[PDB]
Amino acid sequence: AMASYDNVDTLIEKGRYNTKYNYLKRMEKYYPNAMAYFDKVTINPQGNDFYINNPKVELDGEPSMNYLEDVYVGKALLTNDTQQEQKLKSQSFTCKNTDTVTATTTHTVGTSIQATAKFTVPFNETGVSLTTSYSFANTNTNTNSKEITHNVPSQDILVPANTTVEVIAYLKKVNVKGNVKLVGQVSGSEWGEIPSYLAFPRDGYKFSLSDTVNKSDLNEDGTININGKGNYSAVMGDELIVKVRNLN
Amino acid sequence: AMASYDNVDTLIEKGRYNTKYNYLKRMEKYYPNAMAYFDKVTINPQGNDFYINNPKVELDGEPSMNYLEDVYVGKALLTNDTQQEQKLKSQSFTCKNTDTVTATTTHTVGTSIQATAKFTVPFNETGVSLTTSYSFANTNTNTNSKEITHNVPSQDILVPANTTVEVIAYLKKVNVKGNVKLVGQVSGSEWGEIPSYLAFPRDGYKFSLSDTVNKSDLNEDGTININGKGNYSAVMGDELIVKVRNLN
Amino acid sequence: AMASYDNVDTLIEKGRYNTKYNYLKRMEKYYPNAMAYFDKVTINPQGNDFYINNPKVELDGEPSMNYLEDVYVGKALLTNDTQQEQKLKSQSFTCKNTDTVTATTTHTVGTSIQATAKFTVPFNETGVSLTTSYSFANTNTNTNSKEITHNVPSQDILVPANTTVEVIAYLKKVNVKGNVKLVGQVSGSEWGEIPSYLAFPRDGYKFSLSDTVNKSDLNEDGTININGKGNYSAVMGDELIVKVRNLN
Amino acid sequence: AMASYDNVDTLIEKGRYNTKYNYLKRMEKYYPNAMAYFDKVTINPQGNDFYINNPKVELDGEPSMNYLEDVYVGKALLTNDTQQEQKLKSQSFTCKNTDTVTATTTHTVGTSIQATAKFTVPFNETGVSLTTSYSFANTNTNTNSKEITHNVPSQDILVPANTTVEVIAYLKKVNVKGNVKLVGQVSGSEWGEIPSYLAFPRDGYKFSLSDTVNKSDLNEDGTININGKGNYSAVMGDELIVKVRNLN
Amino acid sequence: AMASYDNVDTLIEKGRYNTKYNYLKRMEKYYPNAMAYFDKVTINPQGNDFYINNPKVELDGEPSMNYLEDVYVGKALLTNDTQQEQKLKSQSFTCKNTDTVTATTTHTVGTSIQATAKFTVPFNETGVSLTTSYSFANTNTNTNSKEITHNVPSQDILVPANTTVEVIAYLKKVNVKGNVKLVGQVSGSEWGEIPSYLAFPRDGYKFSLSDTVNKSDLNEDGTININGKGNYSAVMGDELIVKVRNLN
Amino acid sequence: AMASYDNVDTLIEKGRYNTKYNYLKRMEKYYPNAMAYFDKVTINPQGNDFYINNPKVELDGEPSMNYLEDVYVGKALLTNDTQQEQKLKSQSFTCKNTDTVTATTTHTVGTSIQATAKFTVPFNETGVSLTTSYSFANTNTNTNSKEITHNVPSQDILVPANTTVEVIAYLKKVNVKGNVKLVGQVSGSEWGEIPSYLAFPRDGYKFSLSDTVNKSDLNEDGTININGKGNYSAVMGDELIVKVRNLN
Amino acid sequence: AMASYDNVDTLIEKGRYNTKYNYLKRMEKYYPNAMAYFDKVTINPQGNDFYINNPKVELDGEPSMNYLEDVYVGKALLTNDTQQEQKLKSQSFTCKNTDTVTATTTHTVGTSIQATAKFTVPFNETGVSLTTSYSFANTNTNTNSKEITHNVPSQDILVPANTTVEVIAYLKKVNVKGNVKLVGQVSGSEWGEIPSYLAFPRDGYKFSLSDTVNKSDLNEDGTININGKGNYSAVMGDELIVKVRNLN
């Protein structure tokens, strides 16, 4: 109604810590030997489907960078001698990286029929065999590739009449951490599974974002209000540094 | 004529619930043992062909987002030192994902002819055979790939004379739910099949959107008026967040 | 001269119904047992080559849509903080679907020559054979792929100085029915075949669009005037719904 | 000098009818039994190389269309709510069709050396053979693909402040006939062959476009003036019908 | 110094006719039987490396066309109904043609070890062999493809408020002859070979463009001045004919 | 708080020299024979994850170039004769270089059943065998390609009414060294390993950028301030030199 | 300090001639028989890494062209009949040339187990064998392709109201020689090897650009000043000749 929350994670982790509490409670039937064993249980997620009705995401704070490696540094010297202000372009550059994975299976069913026959009349054991084969292969491939391109564009620079500019692009591969603030109305469940510890069973939990928050803390349509900021740590990225400069 | 409906789904589901009623009625000949068994029958669709004459679709309400994972965060620092307002471009990024499926079948028909012959004269059993093969393989492949690209464009930013801008693109993969309102005139049939329950037969129903609505609730041309809103839950998507900012 | 027609189909179907009349007439020689059998004959087309001289096609009426499935919904939040009206771009998206078909045939012709020889002197039957193979494979592949792309573009939006826009693209796959009106002068023949009914022969008809219309209903150059509207039912398609909106 | 011709075809066909006259004349040596046999001779072309010096081609008359099939119909609804005249883009579409042809040939030359040896000491006939193979395959592939794309572009539409446009692209595959008028100076030969009729020989004719026209009907440089119109029947094609329309 | 030449070909052919003179002179040692045999010698080029210092190429004269075949004719009808002057685009078209050539070679080295052994105790000759293979294939492929694209662009046409335009693109494949005039300073050698006539030897000539022209006809830096026009016969090409036309 | 550092490298190398000190200290238990052996130990990195919160990177100093080889030099002569200022384009050029790496593994499991039988009745030993095979291959490929493109763009040049321009692009492949200055707040650890010297063990170190700097030299959030310049030696690159020039 | 050099080549060749002097000096120990043998030694480079700090490259002098062959000549006739100044586009053209190189190696390890058994009871020697195979192939491919594209763009031409333009693009493949002037500060070494002459050893030289120039001819940071011009002979290239012309 009027109360809101500051993350979807403060709800998801609270629900998972409720699931790890319920599942460990469910062990007071036959295996209460590991009861207070509230660790190394590894509740993993499998089916997140929360929806943020009416979302208003927008990023705040500069992204925190983790620099991996340089990719390209391209200079370009664009001279104009045409008694008129031209618009010259520097060079481009793309860097693909494909990773294919394939798994095919063949089933062959052959069949042969030999009809050997030895005469032994002309000279010793001069036989003549005549076989006939037939086979049938039936393969079933299904590959999967994931391509990723980092294109450095080609800047068009208004170079004046008789002068040069000097562009320097410097691409670099990073992965960022950052923060992002959003508001909205979350609602929905999460089905996963509790992997069987080597003395425990495997159970398929499923909780919702309505039984993990105080009742009457949700709107009339089951949605609970969030107004906070979510993190997006460890996201692959880029960083271009262009420096166009007129030298004359 | 003057009466309209608020979905095509309120017609499709009503027709399917009519088909599940008729098909269960058809069991009072030989197998009325499971008669009130109005469940687990799984009437599946196979041949939807309704046409919305004169459609006026338009989306209302902000799409409800379900955030899957981050794809890319790309910063770009575009400096201008050219005593003139330039227009500099940040870097691009594409992310493909192909999934190929293949099924080939080979038919081979070989044939060999051996002509062995043992002399036994020079020394023990020194024979010399001479075979001759011939085969014929005839394969028939037919693959199928489905590629999907999420391209983050390269913004061109009017950076003033001696200053820098600082673009931050942040792509994210989501799948949305939303609502969409449309008006028009639906008309057409739906042919599917009723899968045979383990004590039931399989029958190929086919109903239309004219016998699932009150007669004289359709126009002169068989079409029934709809004026409402249709849902589009669970649609793969994206979400870009660009923040160009002049720092100086 | 002065009389015109309202379709090319009212001519094509009339010619085919003339061909099905002539071919059934041709059965009063040996097989008049199925004479009034004016059905299940399946006159199929094979060689349409009518030309519409001076065509003036133009579509009338909104296309009737048949909605198949959603493909993509992409939001984009483009913020400007640069004290200047920038032009920011949302993200793109492409969706390919390739279907390859292949048929190769290999012809192999091998040849071997074995020269076994058993010494039997050192110990029991210690022979040493030396064969020599030679083969020749000659394959002939000819594949065929058909790719189809549904590209959602990247809108560039004039976002004012310090504010954001909020683009929502929503692609959807449909196949449309519609109507299309054209005028012109049709002329030309249609060669097909009449498939042999299980008590009938196969005959290769060929009629023209000049002997299927009243004589003197054609111009001096054999062409007959059409002025009407042709249908284009069941054509694969798309439907994009863009909604750019300034939120502040 | 001052006389010109109205086609290059009225020259090519006249030269071929001269070649078919000369070649049939050449049969009064040994086989004059089929002499007036001025048909079913099938003079085919092999080496056209006429050049049209100073050409002035330009198309006249609307192309005569032969409609094959519809390819795509794409609607797009572009709404603007930004208090400013934006320029929004509809969706694109491409349709490839590749046809590959391949022909590879492998030559294998193997060689084996077996060294079997039966002990017969431990128990019955317990021999141990040890072979050694070596082969050499040398293949030579040379494929050939021909791709063809029909791209429907993405129109950018100036949609006013608070309103929508409604684009409808309708691609269609046709092949056209048309006419085209050109002037210039043709000159050059045509080498082909006269296929051997089943009672006739095969001869490799070669005529020029200077001995097929009245002498002094050519300029000083051997070229003969043409001023007419050439046909281009049966050319694969497209037909797009865009209808942008502002609805409000 | 002050004398110039009118081709590089009048130098290259003169040098080759000097080489064919020298090489035939070199036959007065052992084989002067074919001495005046100044024909069928086929001096072929292998190593042209002349450089045109300070070139000023520019084409004169319209290219002489040799028409091969039509490729595409695409009509497009772009209607505007938006109470504003829009800019609509017609459809595109590309036509690829790839020709791949491949040559791989495999070297296999196998090895087997069989260990057959016949018991003959349980019943007649019930032996059990156990072989073990090992091979090593080492292939080396190196292909080569040459793709060629003929792209017909998509014209954007300023269609006025309520009216239509009607674009007609007509691509055609030709190969042109033309002339081209250039000035500059040529200098450099040409190494080829004189193929051995069936009574002659093979010799590897090498002449320069300084010993094929009168001395003091070259500048101080060995370069000889050319000022003339060079031909470019038989060059694959295109010919587009666009005709945008406003019909209303 | 108030003290900052001038590199992230002066921290990383100091931490690694601390790790090489600790690990060599850890050898005074069993192997102090190589104790002062402070070399040839090769502490390699494996898990860098420092984040630069609030980074302000910007390049200073011109990049130091190391010229590898020329790639392309493309002239273009764009003449205008249209009594109007046109905008003509020069030619483009791209240079890809792909390097694929593949590793597949097949597992085959065959099975045959022969049923030979010798009659010996008609003549000597005329037997007839009939075998039947069945196999199952299951391969698992996973390739990896890395493409790199160096695109030289196509400059559009405003050539005046009756005159020519003369563009000269000159791409060249280099790899640069340069310097880059950044400020920010670094924080995070580095997990690697100390490879086992041939008399030493292997240990997996892990240090952070907070225990390698004087305490109270870090902010309240564990981050240590950096304000200096980092090097980016040996980065593949390009260098374009465009020279548009109006000649008349 | 104040003295500079006019090439990097006058330094590299001087250093190599110093290396060839030192290495030949090193032969007065055991093999002084070939001492003055100052030729056919072929000092080849392997590890150039000189860096030109603060480079100011810029091309002088028109490139000297060596014409290889014509690639394409494309005419285009763009007519405007729209009572308005349109902007029409000519056709494009691309010419790829890929060269792939591949090297894969397979390692197979098979294993079979036969279990033959001859009954001899029903009739003569009617045995039944049953084998069982198993193999394991492990291949490792790594290809490498190098694509090169020569794209002729599609000029957009402002054709006036009722008139035509006539574009002629003429691409041509050349390789240029040219000169290029640069200034900067070179510094760095060159590691190569001296290949072993058939009576000599192989030695891996390594010299720097600081011990090949007079000391105190270098700046304080080891760099030696260059101010001259470097050549770039034999660089693959293009040459486009566009001639737009308004004919009316």
Residue numbers in the entry:
A (entry chain A), B (entry chain G), C (entry chain F), D (entry chain E), E (entry chain D), F (entry chain B), ...: 13 to 260
Tell me what the authors wrote about this structure, in their words.
Epsilon toxin (Etx) is a pore-forming toxin (PFT) produced by Clostridium perfringens type B and D strains and plays an important role in the pathogenesis of enterotoxaemia, a severe neurological disease of domestic ruminants, particularly sheep. Etx is a member of the aerolysin family of β-PFTs (aβ-PFTs). The protoxin is converted to the active, mature toxin after carboxy- and amino-termini peptides are removed by proteolytic cleavage in the gut, either by digestive proteases of the host, such as trypsin, or protease produced by C. perfringens. Pore formation disrupts the membrane and is central to the damage caused to intoxicated cells, and consequently to the symptoms of disease, due to the leakage of water and small ions through the pores that may lead to cell death.
Thus, the only viable way to study the pore form of Etx was to isolate the complexes directly from cells known to be susceptible to Etx. Although the samples still appeared heterogeneous, approximately two times as many particles remained after clean-up steps as compared to the non-VPP dataset from a dataset that was only 25% larger. This resulted in a final map at an overall resolution of 3.2 Å. The Etx assembly measures ~120 Å across and ~98 Å in height. Each protomer in the pore structure can be divided into three domains: the β-hairpin domain (blue), the cap domain (yellow) and the RBD (green). The β-hairpin domain (residues 95–173) creates the inner β-barrel, which begins at the top of the pore and runs through the entire length of the assembly, including the membrane-spanning region. At its narrowest point the diameter of the lumen is constricted to ~12 Å by the seven Lys108 residues, which protrude into the lumen (rectangle). In the intracellular side of the membrane two aromatic residues, Phe131 and Phe135, form the usual aromatic belt found in β-barrel transmembrane regions. Unique to Etx, and unlike lysenin and aerolysin, the individual RBDs are well separated and do not interact with their neighbours, and thus do not contribute to any oligomerization surfaces. The cap domain moves downward towards the membrane by 45 Å creating a kink in the straight cap domain. Examination of the Etx pore structure reveals that H162 may also play a role in stabilizing the DBB fold by forming a hydrogen bond with D250 in the cap domain.
